[PDB]
């Protein structure tokens, strides 16, 4: 297989009429497929449901935007049974034609760009160009998985000659799996976590976000038209623990990749550790479970770029990002002029209706709303509130941009990761001040320093202990091959998504000797 | 740092006059210092205390080899504190300083080659040659990780670029870890488990089997000597599990590297899913534990070969090893005249004391004694004695090579690891079936297949699932960096040691993007 | 580390109107801050002096474009002790960070591209695109030296491996050294000589060109603001010879860099290799001294592309360039066409204020007019004047392109370098005659062929002895990592700038052996 060096599929930015345009006309295609129905996808096949799950506008929630069938545990055994069916002759695939496959399904998403684009903004009330990175990214995923995987291809194991014998040590996929989506990036995420074990041998089972079904439907759509043989990939979307617990906690399922809350991945990793009754094997989880991203600005750094910066990374998708910059952490002579103009681009964002591109579309669901109004009256006990904290007119679950001042470093505002559109500030005296304030909560995954200062920034690459840190730069938006995305501390196992490492967590090795 | 390419140790065979006068030089100065006392060794010094720990010769358990003071969770505690502190700056040294550090380590170790051989004669019962070949590996394992270490130095992680910025990935240690070690590889294993995790800048606290304190001491002379710095590995004999569930289940454990049975790597990697009380990360666990190794014979092979490496497999160490074949899988047509070669074989293998160089020396311990004896009494109601079954008359811990066959497939004999001389005979019909009942284990760490039908061999390649694999020739004494060693299914977590992938599973990655 | 590959900055043409109304910009900016102060930089902060220097500009002699402060000896002391100082940590400073903080100084160096063309338009003389051109070659020297290093990083040597020994040999920088700047190129060459020593742990006292010193201090306001360390890289404009000879004579200098005349350069040579009194080092002294440099033009030629070609190399910047060529050398069925050609071209060739972007502006300074009319007035007595040879109207140091014909070979205008605006034509037999006569100077630095014939090219690849050769193209403007620049003979010590066996020249190596 010989393709193209790996490039990261550009972001639309919109600026061009005909990007406009054609976004637009997506738009109303999907507005116009609403009262569309997806059921489940086992063994190659669609599969519905007697219940249904109802996918809801978070810009106008009385508003349908798709319904899906609702998988229960029966349909979690059949889709745990045709993946380990399909798993039997999909291990045996030469790598250079799975990979072929991974490449085919990247150029069906790509023509199907706008349309994604236009699910996620009325599924999950991204803005314009949060959706195109989303989508972006996702197709970037599967283009890397499907050259990386070659990297691994039989017998790619360095090992030490011996007389009158062949030594040989290759790779060989895990087995069957389940993939626990976030509902945050439901195209990209949902994507990179599917076709990572896909590509080196693995079958997987999906379970879609509640919030973000009917986009995870479309992707299951592109993988059927990709031709990924019955039982490889799974769709089941389902409410509440059912269909997870059922598999997390199975003796046959070999691997869960999990994304979601700290909350839920600490269960995850406890049950994974456990052997099932009847279970042949130890279970390996992946966990990605959110941060509580700090910015630290000093008193050398350029404060215009900074406050951009910081505003992009607090508030960018309404702050629901796991890297998104939620605390502000500033020494004591950038302290007024970092907040002031923070205050003056953060008063200026417009939050509405996501289709109109606004700055900020709405919080993804009536309960994300209830945990960030929540959050933001524990705020104004801890901290002093000085903009937004108010749910905006509309049905629409529409919070405006809000920042805390005066908030200590151990106030549950700047330790808790609220996923909403909530900045926390902390002043510090100094720059050590500022990394010990950054290392100081249980998580380790963005963090970010704008400082002109040499000295502060290469100690900050030393000592600011996150698993990706950005100078001079935005701290979200990580990019597939770029930058190796995944934390430490309580933001998870460090499975570092788009990087040639991510898919030797999906291998295990074979070492055989033949003596002559 | 510029070294020689690696190569293994060579292992003594002690059929030179000078190996023969060095050996008994070395077994009557190990003889001569029986009764030695060994203390603890924390933050970079031996510490003793009040109680203590006995360690007898399996040979003569009337003869006390040595004592060693005994850890309690406050050592345990003080060890942890030591390596926390050691680990501030140990993570900082440059690789090549580290690097260099095991290779001094291994200079002083093949140094006192043959006072660890007799150690390891006296104390755990190994015969001449599997001494020798336990302190070659030991050797290995440093000169290996030393150099793979280099591989992972700063920064190692390939990336693509990105306009207008730096993009750096690379790796971090995790911290300060347990290390959990075999009585039956006390030097190898012992040493390789420790030293992988450190060549990378962790710290660890080491707990020695009970039955094997005083070779673990003599290791940890050898790093006291070669200099690592104070709390940098630390060693915690201790009796019973004390020391090892209170490091397991403790919050600031990083990671644990555990060799052992598998009813106790069980709990600790149930143990290690947990999040302990103020824990502020996810604990990886690394367990191997054990296996139910099969030779497959078929009617193509060279009977004689077969027979010999199935004795070596079987019998070695007195059957105490992981790799052991304690099953041979006979297809019709192989089963007599492999079954009689290896009972004409069997039957004149030598038992008694270890210091003798017999074939056999005893099993480790009294319990070990009561195990192997007790799962005689089992197989003796489940298959047909053919060949021993017995204790032999002595106050040492012997039992004579025992056979049992016609055994059933899922007999408790030939489904559970009884770690002693005792082997399980299978008759099946053809190669199909063969490889049907050697996969039909809960284990899955090595297993051989004497043969000279290619498409037997090549079937086996792929289809016969241990991680280890082994073509007519003995399927014990993987060799460091030849043959990566580690398994599947309840066999463990597939960390293959002396492998370029097992130092990956001692570190973290970070990425850090400057935007110019 | 991990950047885009190398690749050189575009050359503005200014063929847009935004890129000609951002020059009209910048041009204004520039020349409303003419009535600017600049002192000297020493140890990280910007120092006055008493007396001060003026810069004119060359287009309007009785305009300042600038004034700055004055160092002498003390300044120069001060300098050195600031410089050593700093290099007892910079050397430490591991590479990847010493190569990001080049990085920032060429990200902050192309934010101000325009206006340090413009700088360049007023201060000495070039037109817009030779304003670009420079400023281009600055970025370049910082981006391929920031990359270049990293080859070098530790440990870098490839040595052969000892039994039972690490050997490890790597370098180290030099210490503190001077470098002495040209006028013509004092953004691109002025940076380039800087940045190159420093970026593999050197640090750097630099003496501008007295014409230039405006411009070098722009410079220094990068550096600064790109954050190099107090005592890295220092600043230190003066008049006649006080601080290059201190500096250049100094015990303590450990290096010198200088680009210049041959006159100063075989000062500077003959002082380098002498021991000043306490003096504990062989000095380095890296010099590029200029040329005397020939296209060659034979009968085969494309004699259009030969004259355009030629044109271009002559008269680009009034001919004040080490690569000008200042010897046409014409077989005899190229003469009579190429010269027609020649005199056409350079006929129509515009002379004024550098602002309009005249073909040539004037010559740098009053002394520059003298010499060049000095040596147009010994050109009279030499060979025959065909074109030009005047002083042009207005107190600009405006000089018409000139042709002298009928050139003997061992004419003064035919040896000695003019550095102005001043063409020697000779006429030759053949292509053999045509390569004697281009190589019987004392110089060797550029060089061209126009010809179609292979034979000659590739006779002209062996033979023509020049550091710099190009076919069928101007002999000017060589590309940083294209074209490694630097000469044979006396042109210099073929120190090749842009090139990765640059940072060599200011490295030591080490070999350290350990015997474990
Ligand atoms: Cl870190
Ligand atoms: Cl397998
Ligand atoms: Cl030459
Ligand atoms: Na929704
Ligand atoms: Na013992
Ligand atoms: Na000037």
């Known amino acids: 297989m010989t393709v193209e060096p790996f490039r990261n599929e550009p972001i639309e930015t919109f600026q061009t009429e005909e990007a406009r345009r054609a976004m637009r006309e997506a738009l109303r295609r999907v507005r116009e497929e609403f009262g569309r129905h997806y059921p489940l996808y086992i063994g190659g096949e669609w599969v519905d449901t007697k219940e249904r799950m109802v996918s809801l506008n978070p810009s106008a929630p009385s508003e349908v935007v798709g319904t899906t069938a609702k998988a229960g545990k029966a349909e979690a055994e059949a889709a745990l049974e045709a993946a380990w069916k399909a798993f039997k002759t999909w291990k045996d695939w030469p790598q250079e034609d799975r990979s072929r496959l991974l490449l085919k399904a990247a150029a069906l998403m790509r023509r199907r760009k706008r349309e994604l684009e236009a699910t996620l903004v009325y599924e999950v009330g991204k803005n314009w160009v949060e959706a195109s990175a989303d989508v972006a990214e996702a197709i970037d995923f599967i283009e890397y998985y499907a050259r990386a995987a070659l990297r691994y291809r039989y017998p790619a194991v360095e090992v030490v000659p011996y007389p009158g014998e062949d030594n040989e040590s290759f790779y060989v996929p895990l087995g069957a799996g389940v993939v626990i989506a976030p509902w945050?990036?439901?195209?990209?995420?949902?994507?990179?976590?599917?076709?990572?074990?896909?590509?080196?041998?693995?079958?997987?089972?999906?379970?879609?976000?509640?919030?973000?079904?009917?986009?995870?439907?479309?992707?299951?759509?592109?993988?059927?038209?990709?031709?990924?043989?019955?039982?490889?990939?799974?769709?089941?979307?389902?409410?509440?623990?059912?269909?997870?617990?059922?598999?997390v906690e199975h003796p046959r399922i070999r691997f869960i990749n999990f994304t979601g809350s700290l909350e839920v991945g600490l269960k995850i990793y406890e049950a994974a550790g456990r052997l099932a009754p009847g279970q042949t094997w130890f279970k390996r989880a992946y966990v990605e479970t959110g941060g509580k991203d700090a910015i630290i600005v000093d008193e050398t750094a350029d404060f215009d770029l900074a406050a951009e910066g910081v505003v992009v990374s607090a508030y960018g998708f309404q702050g629901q990002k796991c890297s998104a910059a939620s605390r502000l952490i500033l020494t004591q002579g950038?302290?007024?002029?970092?907040?002031?103009?923070?205050?003056?681009?953060?008063?200026?964002?417009?939050?509405?209706?996501?289709?109109?591109?606004?700055?900020?579309?709405?919080?993804?669901?009536?309960?994300?709303?209830?945990?960030?109004?929540?959050?933001?009256?524990?705020?104004?006990?801890?901290?002093?509130?000085?903009?937004?904290?108010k749910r905006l007119e509309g049905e629409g679950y529409f919070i405006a941009?809000?920042?805390?001042?005066?908030?200590?470093?151990?106030?549950?505002?700047?330790?808790?990761?609220?996923?909403?559109?909530?900045?926390?500030?902390?002043?510090?005296?100094?720059?050590?001040?500022?990394?010990?304030?950054?290392?100081?909560?249980?998580?380790?995954?963005?963090?970010?320093?704008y400082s002109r200062k040499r000295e502060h920034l290469e100690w900050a690459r030393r000592e600011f202990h996150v698993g990706n840190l950005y100078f001079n730069r935005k701290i979200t938006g990580a990019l597939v091959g770029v930058q190796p995305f995944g934390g430490f501390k309580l933001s998870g196992t460090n499975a570092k998504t788009g990087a040639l490492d991510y898919l030797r967590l999906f291998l295990e090795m074979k070492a055989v000797a033949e003596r002559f």
């Open 184 to 247: 945050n990036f439901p195209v990209a995420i949902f994507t990179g976590m599917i076709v990572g074990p896909v590509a080196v041998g693995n079958t997987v089972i999906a379970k879609p976000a509640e919030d973000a079904v009917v986009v995870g439907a479309k992707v299951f759509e592109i993988f059927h038209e990709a031709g990924f043989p019955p039982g490889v990939v799974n769709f089941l979307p389902g409410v509440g623990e059912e269909v997870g617990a059922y598999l």
């Open 401 to 449: 941009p809000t920042v805390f001042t005066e908030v200590p470093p151990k106030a549950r505002i700047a330790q808790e990761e609220i996923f909403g559109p909530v900045l926390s500030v902390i002043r510090v005296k100094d720059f050590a001040e500022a990394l010990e304030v950054a290392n100081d909560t249980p998580y380790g995954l963005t963090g970010g320093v």
């Open 334 to 389: 950038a302290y007024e002029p970092v907040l002031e103009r923070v205050l003056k681009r953060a008063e200026r964002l417009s939050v509405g209706p996501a289709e109109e591109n606004p700055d900020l579309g709405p919080v993804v669901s009536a309960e994300q709303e209830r945990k960030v109004l929540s959050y933001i009256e524990i705020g104004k006990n801890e901290g002093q509130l000085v903009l937004g904290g």
